[PDB]
Amino acid sequence: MDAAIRGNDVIFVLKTIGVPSACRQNEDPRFVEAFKCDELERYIDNNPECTLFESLRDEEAYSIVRIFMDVDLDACLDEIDYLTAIQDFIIEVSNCVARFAFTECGAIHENVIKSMRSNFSLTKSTNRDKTSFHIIFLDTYTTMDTLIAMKRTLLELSRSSENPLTRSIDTAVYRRKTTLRVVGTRKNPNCDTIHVMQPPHDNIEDYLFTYVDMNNNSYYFSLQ
Ligand SMILES: [Mg+2]
Ligand SMILES: [Mg+2]
């Protein structure tokens, strides 16, 4: 933990793709709402058609986030290839982030490796025609500007890798005002596929990239 780094338990969600700036700013409940996690879980239960997108509420004021990736393989994998690819993916992505943190962020390389590999949540999209998931490194924190600075590094990783999952990292998600679709909710009123939670993580806070509650196991770094 660190005095200079405070947490966040207020989750800001957009209720559709492409919300105006004016509607985010005025927080029109038709388009956006801030929730505690228990409120968010209840809202999802009570709104079975919802399409929810987590976003930083005021990233000029506060932009601490968990490292996350949106993996977009528009192809099907054999089950065993997928399991092997996930494990190799974790190694490749953690090595890549740890090197960037070490050289660009004054970070402790082994703490990035350990925090990333030891605890992460995985979703699985129900679309069986592809291999889509979101990953949250629950205990590895940074700033959104650091993720933006790391965008080309991840792009180059996705180009050099032989791993089909690493190759499918969607680096366009690292940008200002970005969104991550909330697990269990739909993308749009016309597509009914969802991401489901995966063991061993079954609480919604484990699937949110703006939920920040560090403990001494947590590790934080940012651009130096
Ligand atoms: Mg995706
Ligand atoms: Mg994507």
Numbering used by the authors: 1 to 224
Quote from the publication:
Helicase E5 is a multi-domain protein; its primer synthesis and DNA unwinding activity are required for genome uncoating and DNA replication of MPXV. MPXV E5 is encoded by the E5R gene, the mature protein is 785 amino acids (aa) in length. MPXV E5 can be divided into 6 domains: the AEP domain, the ZnD domain (Zinc-binding domain), the D5N domain (a domain associated with D5-type helicases), the Linker, the SF3 Helicase domain, and the C-Tail.
Supported by the low RMSD value (0.6 Å), the overall foldings of the AEP domains are very similar in the crystal and cryo-EM structures. No DNA template or RNA product was observed, but clear electron densities confirmed that two Mg2+ ions (common factor of DNA and RNA polymerase) and one pyrophosphate group (PPi) were captured in the AEP structure. Since no PPi was included in the crystallization sample, the observed PPi should be produced by the AEP-catalyzed de novo synthesis reaction. In addition to the side chains of Asp70, Asp72 and Asp170, the A-site Mg2+ ion also coordinates with three water molecules. The B-site Mg2+ ion coordinates with the side chains of Asp70 and Asp72, two water molecules, and two oxygen atoms of PPi. PPi in the MPXV E5 structure well mimics the β- and γ-phosphate groups of the incoming site (E-site) dATP in the MsCAPP structure. The similar structural arrangements suggested that the AEP domain of MPXV E5 follows the conserved two-cation-assisted, in-line attacking mechanism in catalysis, in which A-site cation activates the initiating site (I-site) NTP (or dNTP) by removing the proton from the 3′-OH group and B-site cation facilitates the reaction by increasing the electrophilicity of the phosphorus center. The de novo primer synthesis activity can be implicated by the PPi molecule observed in the crystal structure of the AEP domain of MPXV E5.
